[PDB]
């Protein structure tokens, strides 16, 4: 007769009614991804339309339930997650124009066009092309030309579209009784209604800034080392005091620096730890890889795979008989069935991607003991970090030689360890300042701190001051440079990767100290430790029922987001970088634009 009983009844009814629809939609999506035909796409579209109609219908009845007369935290969180208006508090024409702009931007970004001059052909799509030209090439002219073309052709063309998109998003955020769109995106890490464990929505910016202030020395040393190693490759192209150019970062946008491992390798005569050729010499396939991954997961304390996991997963590419996407995805159906869609090869990266997907499935099975409104990770970075930590811990030579991949008589030299640490640095920390700068730019352009003009000017001044990247060609106030990414042109956040990076080292240090292991962290294997596995299993069962601060305190023992584990992990590499940068210049300076 009270509000609590009616709220619980409505929540139970919604959870019982939406599970079947979600399972049908997931099955349709699986049938579409595993079989590209004219009927699967129609079935998936119909399922998506039905799900959208159901979600829109089950929102007005949930909004009627008040939130200020609730004593249960779980019911309040479920109602807050269900009463999300989103794109509903707006006008018809405004929402239609916003959807049209989103769709046309997505199509323009997905299609793409090269259209090289003085050539009536060779105007390719996002298929193989400028990617490998900007990744594994050493020519300055073609790289500069590609970096200019990709930013001038898919750039200023979407400037008014992006302006209207930002304006409409700010209007939607302000019309929902909330602050600007930046605050709406930051509200994902908001914790209210809990005494002691409350986390302010604005404290996230201060925490990120405090972590970046301590990351700054390591990133500066890494940038100095990269510049010193690059000056020997491009004579009279990079100054030891200036900043590195944009098109010489091994990436179209300079996000990942994985392609610089072949040019910045200190010991080029020492082989890596690639055990790909060791598996092809004997009977090994995707089934054996998944069996070894399950054996590694059960050695910590995680349960085994489900019965439907081994009879429904398509771990082998069927070939030309049918079209199927080979993108590694973790399917969470919600009815006890869990399967992974991946064309697992006998390579090395797939060996860790399989463990990543298995950790995702483990987290799914862990939080599957909650209602539908809570069957998800704590934040948008924990679900990926749970698999990322396992993929990082499974790539150790000790685990490979214990399974039977690496030879037991293989010596553990320090050159290979330094090379592995440098590769991990280039693949992890190389995107942290870029992500931070992009997120700060999005926050300042959504809040209102940046006027309508002077967007690219402030973008480049931040990329020169905060980041160590400089543009090779000057761009006026008409080009649209930041809109060249996928997350910006499709309304996707970027702080999730930064949170995952700041949480993975903490989780690794916690799971290593829980097993009573001595020595450095880069060689600490999470195996044969039941206490750490039990702690991780108890922590993953929280999900969205409890705040992420309580989960971090239960898995680590901290109430904030710290970066000290990252420093403790990179200290063996930080000391080596300090010793190598003794006869060089540390840091970078501004006012060195190659104009």
């Amino acid at each position: 007769s009270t509000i609590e009983e009616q709220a619980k009844t409505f929540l139970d009814k919604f959870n019982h009614e939406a599970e079947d629809l979600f399972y049908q939609s997931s099955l349709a999506s699986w049938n579409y991804n595993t079989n590209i035909t004219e009927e699967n796409v129609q079935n998936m579209n119909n399922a998506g339309d039905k799900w959208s109609a159901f979600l829109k219908e089950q929102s007005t009845l949930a909004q009627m339930y008040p939130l200020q007369e609730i004593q249960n935290l779980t019911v309040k969180l479920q109602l807050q997650a269900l009463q999300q208006n989103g794109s509903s508090v707006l006008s018809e024409d405004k929402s239609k124009r916003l959807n049209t702009i989103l769709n046309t931007m997505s199509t323009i970004y997905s299609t793409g066009k090269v259209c090289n001059p003085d050539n009536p052909q060779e105007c390719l799509l996002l298929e193989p092309g400028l990617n490998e030209i900007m990744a594994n090439s050493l020519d300055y002219n073609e790289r500069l030309w590609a970096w200019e073309s990709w930013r001038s052709e898919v750039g200023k063309q979407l400037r008014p579209l992006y302006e209207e998109y930002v304006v409409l998003k700010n209007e939607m955020a302000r019309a929902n009784h909330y602050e600007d769109y930046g605050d709406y995106w930051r509200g994902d890490y908001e914790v209210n209604g809990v005494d002691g464990y409350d986390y302010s929505r604005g404290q996230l910016i201060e925490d990120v800034e405090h972590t970046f202030e301590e990351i700054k020395p390591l990133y500066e040393h890494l940038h100095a080392y990269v510049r010193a190693k690059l000056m020997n490759a491009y004579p009279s192209y990079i100054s030891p005091i200036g900043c590195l150019p944009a098109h010489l970062l091994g990436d179209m946008w300079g996000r990942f620096w994985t392609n610089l491992y072949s040019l910045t390798v200190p010991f080029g005569q020492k082989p890596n730890i690639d055990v790909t050729d060791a598996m092809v010499d004997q009977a090994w396939d995707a089934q054996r890889i998944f069996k070894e991954a399950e054996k590694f997961f059960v050695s910590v304390g995680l349960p085994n795979m489900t019965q439907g996991f081994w009879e429904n997963s398509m771990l082998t590419d069927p070939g030309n008989v049918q079209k199927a996407v080979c993108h590694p995805t973790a399917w969470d159906l919600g009815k006890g069935d869990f399967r992974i869609l991946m064309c697992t090869k006998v390579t090395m990266d797939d060996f860790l991607t399989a463990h990543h997907e298995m950790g995702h499935i483990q987290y799914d099975m862990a939080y599957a003991a909650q209602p539908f409104l809570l069957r998800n990770g704590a934040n948008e970075g924990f679900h990926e970090a749970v698999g990322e930590i396992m993929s990082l811990s499974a790539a150790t030579p000790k685990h490979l030689k214990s399974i039977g991949l690496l030879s037991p008589d293989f010596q553990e030299d320090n050159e290979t360890e330094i090379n592995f640490l440098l590769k991990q640095a280039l693949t992890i920390v190389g995107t942290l300042p870029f992500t931070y700068m992009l997120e700060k730019w999005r926050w300042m352009v959504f809040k209102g701190e940046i006027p309508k003009d002077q967007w690219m000017k402030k973008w480049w001044e931040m990329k020169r001051e905060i980041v160590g990247v400089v543009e090779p060609v000057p761009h006026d106030e008409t080009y649209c440079d930041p809109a060249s990414l996928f997350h910006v042109s499709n309304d996707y956040s970027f702080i999730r990767y930064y949170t995952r990076t700041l949480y993975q080292f903490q989780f690794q240090e916690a799971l290593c100290q829980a097993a009573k292991h001595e020595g450095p962290l880069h060689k600490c294997d999470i195996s044969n430790s039941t206490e750490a596995g039990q702690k991780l299993f108890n922590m993953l069962r929280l999900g969205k029922s409890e705040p992420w601060t309580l989960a971090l305190e239960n898995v680590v023992g901290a109430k904030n987001m710290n970066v000290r584990p990252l420093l403790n992990y990179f200290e063996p590499l930080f000391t080596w970088l300090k010793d190598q940068n003794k006869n060089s210049f540390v840091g970078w300076s501004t006012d060195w634009s190659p104009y």
């Binding site: 009983e5 009616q6 009844t9 139970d12 009814k13 079947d20 049908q24 009627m64």
Partner: protein
């Protein structure tokens, strides 16, 4: 999806041991009387399984 098996979900009181109920009256969670039709707090008692 097999929608042939159903189950009773909403009730106003606990059942006695070895008791079987046949009436399928709509449940009422609020003070508003349910006039035989669904509404804000008027839900169907029987729910199907998947």
């Amino acid at each position: 999806g097999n929608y042939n098996y159903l189950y009773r979900l909403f009730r106003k009181s606990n059942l006695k041991p070895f008791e079987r109920d046949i009436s399928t009256e709509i449940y009422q969670a609020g003070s508003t009387p349910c006039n035989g039709v669904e509404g804000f707090n008027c839900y169907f008692p029987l729910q199907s399984y998947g």
